[PDB]
Amino acid sequence: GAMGSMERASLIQKAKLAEQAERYEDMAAFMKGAVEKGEELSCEERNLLSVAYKNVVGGQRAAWRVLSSIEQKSNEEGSEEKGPEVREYREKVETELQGVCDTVLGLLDSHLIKEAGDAESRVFYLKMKGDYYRYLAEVATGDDKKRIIDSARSAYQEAMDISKKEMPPTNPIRLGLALNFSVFHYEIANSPEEAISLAKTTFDEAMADLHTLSEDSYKDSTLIMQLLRDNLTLWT
Amino acid sequence: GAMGSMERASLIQKAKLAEQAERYEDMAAFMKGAVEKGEELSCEERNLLSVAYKNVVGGQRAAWRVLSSIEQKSNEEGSEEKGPEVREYREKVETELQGVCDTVLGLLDSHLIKEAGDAESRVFYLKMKGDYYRYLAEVATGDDKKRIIDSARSAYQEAMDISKKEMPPTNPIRLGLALNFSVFHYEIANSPEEAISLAKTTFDEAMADLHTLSEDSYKDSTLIMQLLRDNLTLWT
Amino acid sequence: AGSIPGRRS
Amino acid sequence: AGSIPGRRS
16 A cells, blocks of 8 residues: 555654645545554544545535436436436446445454454444445445445444443443434434434433533533434424 | 546536536546647636636645645744654645646646637636746745746736737736736735735726626626725735 | 534544 | 635636
8 A cells, every 4th residue: 555654653643734734535545554554543543534534425425415416307307418427427426435435444344343342442433334334325226225224234233232331321432323323214224213212312311421521521422412402303 | 648538528517517516626637638639618618627726726725835834833943853744744735736737737838828819718828827837836945936936927927918908907807817916926926016006006997997897797897806905905 | 414523533 | 815716617
């Protein structure tokens, strides 16, 4: 890999610079290089990996949705035939998005998850696995769509099981996992009632645990609780 | 080139889709492919070329300024030595930015400018030449900095001479050229008085010509006049 | 609905 | 100071 000659610490340092410069493709490449050094990632390093790829795939997802909308309009009654270009370009962006998801999933499988023993690392990576299968499910339309959805579900479920056994209900990783799994249920799995129930129960169990927290931990947890509430307001 | 197999019209169509999707690197690649078909560009196509590369180089310039600022702080009295990484990464972004500028300048030289006979196309391309030499001057520090600055100046001056002879003082191309050449004087050439005088005279000569314009042309011209005024307010 | 934004460290 | 923004067609 092109980062094979760069020191691990230099890759980390440059990932932080790339974030400051809003160079998220660079940030992701630096973090991929750091993962490929083979050592486990610290909490901060896991977060840099996630931020980098979240920004990259976020731009691709936004572009894909714009193009998909144009493509759908072109296939409406009365719409002038414009040739293959919209489909081709949507397919181009889709393939690139799938490539990024495959890259992230590949890092998780080789070998971040299998070396992650602590709940905070293991839940974090399993949540990420669910998230990137979810992004693949957003664009899937073929014979593997059901399997992609099931892969997302399975990763989220394993993360949930660990999080409930090993983390307090206010833990921000646990909360963000629940939030994202609820979005999976609503947007991917056609299960809005499961989505609502999960968000509700998560919010309520966190509320009851806030009294145990410092001021700074309280801020961290309540921020994510508000996202759960925002979704519940949209969905109900 | 990778766009050599795609129809000119399909490249244009996809450049417009890429803009909608905020995929400016794609947009630039599509427009480069269109230029390389060898035909002259229409007014709309010239604007797509410019928007695409302006967005690409804009991201690079913003990143370069962030990194350069960090690098300058690291070289202050009392700053902990952190190794070569900041310089290396600033250099990486700088080299990429220079590559984009060289690509644009190469399209202008082979062969957009030499085929551009009408004032609207020729001034547009010569302004672009000045702009991309200006972006090269922003990062230049070596023995060619003076020549880069002079190349920007010369392109802007040829554009100015044509614009004054062939376009009314409210023409938006003429106005944007004057605006950018004034920025060149202020930011690159260490000539704030020339910058102020040019912006003033441009604004005043445009104001006196507004009475000739339709409502829509008036909106176009006054928008750029306001940019001239904004700079004058900052500079005086 | 929104997932975790997750775009800033 | 600002040059022409130029980032939207």
